[PDB]
Amino acid sequence: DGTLDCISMALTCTFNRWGTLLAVGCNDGRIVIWDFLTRGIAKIISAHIHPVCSLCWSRDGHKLVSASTDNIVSQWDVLSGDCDQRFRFPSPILKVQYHPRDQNKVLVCPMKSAPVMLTLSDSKHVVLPVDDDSDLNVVASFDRRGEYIYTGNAKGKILVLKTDSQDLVASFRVTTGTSNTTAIKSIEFARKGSCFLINTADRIIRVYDGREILTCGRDGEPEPMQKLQDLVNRTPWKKCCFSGDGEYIVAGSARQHALYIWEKSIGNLVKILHGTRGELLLDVAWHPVRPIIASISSGVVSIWAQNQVENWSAFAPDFKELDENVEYEE
Amino acid sequence: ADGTLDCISMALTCTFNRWGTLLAVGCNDGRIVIWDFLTRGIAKIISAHIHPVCSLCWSRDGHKLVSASTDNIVSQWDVLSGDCDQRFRFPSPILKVQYHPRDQNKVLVCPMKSAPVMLTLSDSKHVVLPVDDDSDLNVVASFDRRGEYIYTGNAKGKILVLKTDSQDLVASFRVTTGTSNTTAIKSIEFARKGSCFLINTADRIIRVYDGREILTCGRDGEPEPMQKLQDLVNRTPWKKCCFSGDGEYIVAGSARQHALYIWEKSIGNLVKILHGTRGELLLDVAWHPVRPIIASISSGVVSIWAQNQVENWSAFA
Amino acid sequence: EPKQTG
């Protein structure tokens, strides 16, 4: 729908809180920050020697936290390019995430270890509790306010811990209807409200109200607000997330390079965006405050946007853009 | 044969919101078009005036737009809904409307014939500001950056600095030519960083002052401008000028060629000229508050001039 | 001191 020609070997991407900038982690170990206002590069960071597989913006928009494949986790100053701090873990890192209300805390999700929460100023840490003991593969997410941490393991068990104490305050196993378990591949929260979604190995996206889970308490059976799946092709989902307002959900099918978009409330498929057929889908993000979606496939970023009813059905004045490509400088 | 020429709008005036995600554009048909930098298309259209809108200003919080038409009507618009919040009828036309940069309950209106007026909108009191010598034909004015002072300038080159709340004269001076004649003050613009501002005068010289030096000087001072900027080759007069977002550059639109001149403020040096399509009349210019982007309106068409940082790579097959 | 045009 319009790809970015200035960025190559894209691997992961995330918007800042206002969606003026797009941080793009790349296969060459660089973070390239693209600017929605100038439609050009804002900042390049030489961040690793190994591919950048995970990024997260601090709430104040000044810091980036990244993870390599060398098991390094670094915090960057987006203005200066400087590395404020750097941690090396045993085993590789799936996910890094700032505490949403406190950028001194970051959550790390290692491959074979339990999840770890750090504080950057005092280089202290917590390893978080774990249910099946042989969890090994566990993913975790702060909730929208950062007062709880949700985890999911390979056996379909969701722990709800309180971020300060790490105390189990709610839990439930996610059901295949049958009774067989199903692995949790990711947990994502809406930017507005209390809803979150779970991507699972049975290829059904489950939408839950966070409060519905707290009420159900320890070892509950909360029922999903919504169950999203593709019953034609039974497609697996590479990545899912909410719209910034939280009432739509996009999920990327790598298998058929397409993005499905449902309504969260009612549940019906609203539309499917098809990219080229050669390419493999790597990442998807939804703009925090606009009907814009970013896609990475085969190292190319694609922006999908939606303008309102007008744009010439309204006989508006003409807009022309004159762009002056200049060389990136620090 | 014709048809769509009848209803397509001409842009006449434009202004960025505080973060430069939105460009508000006023048109000949009274509409206000809100253009979105993030999606690169129109977000909203406000059906605002019966007549061309000529002045526009965004509130600090981004939710309200104040606008002036050729009806001598000053309206406040709620941008999310598109509803009018409040309307004023003036006698004589309006040159300029401006929100107080820190308190959007106050609006400065500059009528052509009259002296400038400051509205409080929670309750609609106005209060005329003082004017010297009563050449009150063509008084221009502007809040300074934080809105503690209003700066006025008249057709005889007299600049007053007034306290905003108390309205009391705290500094003044008179801008003269190299021949000790006065020249008319055509516009006043403050930068978004620092305390410098600029004036466009009828003698085709943009003067840059430090507002700190001017308060220091007090009533009937002689402060000298930090910079005097002008077309040395063609002596073009200036339709409109303003600072870059950080205050280090000044753009100035030629009233006689579709051309934008850009100087570095500190050393007064002219670094580039943007030539629009030949033959068009330049109507407005705005520098983006936080980016190297300039919007300009000429012959009803909006132009976005943007620098885009790229790397040198390109394809080989 | 450049110039750009169009």
Numbering used by the authors:
A (entry chain A): 18 to 347
B (entry chain B): 17 to 333
C (entry chain C): 361 to 366
Paper excerpt:
The multi-protein complex WRAD, formed by WDR5, RbBP5, Ash2L and Dpy30, binds to the MLL SET domain to stabilize the catalytically active conformation required for histone H3K4 methylation. The amino terminus of RbBP5, residues 1–325, is composed of a series of canonical WD40 repeats that are predicted to form a seven bladed β-propeller domain, which is the major structural feature of the protein. However, it is the region immediately following this domain, residues 340–380, that stimulates methyltransferase activity through cooperative interactions with the other members of WRAD complex and the MLL SET domain.
After screening a wide range of constructs, diffracting crystals of the RbBP51–380 construct were obtained, which contains both the β-propeller and the regions known to interact with other members of the MLL complex. The structure was determined by molecular replacement, for details see ‘Materials and Methods’ section, and refined to a resolution of 2.5Å. The asymmetric unit contains two copies of the construct, and data collection and refinement statistics are presented in Table 1. The two copies of the β-propeller are linked in the crystal structure due to a strand swap which disrupts the seventh blade of the copy B propeller. Between the third and fourth strands of the 5th propeller blade there is an insert which includes a short α-helix, which lies on one face of the propeller toward the rim. A conspicuous feature of the RbBP5 β-propeller, which appears to be quite distinct from other WD40 proteins in chromatin modification complexes such as WDR5 in MLL and EED and RbAp48 in PRC2, is that the central axis is not formed from bulky aromatic side chains, but instead polar residues dominate the propeller axis. On the ‘top’ face, defined as the face containing the α-helical insert, the propeller axis has a complete ring of basic side-chains, which extends into a basic groove between blades six and seven, and so reaches toward the edge of the propeller.
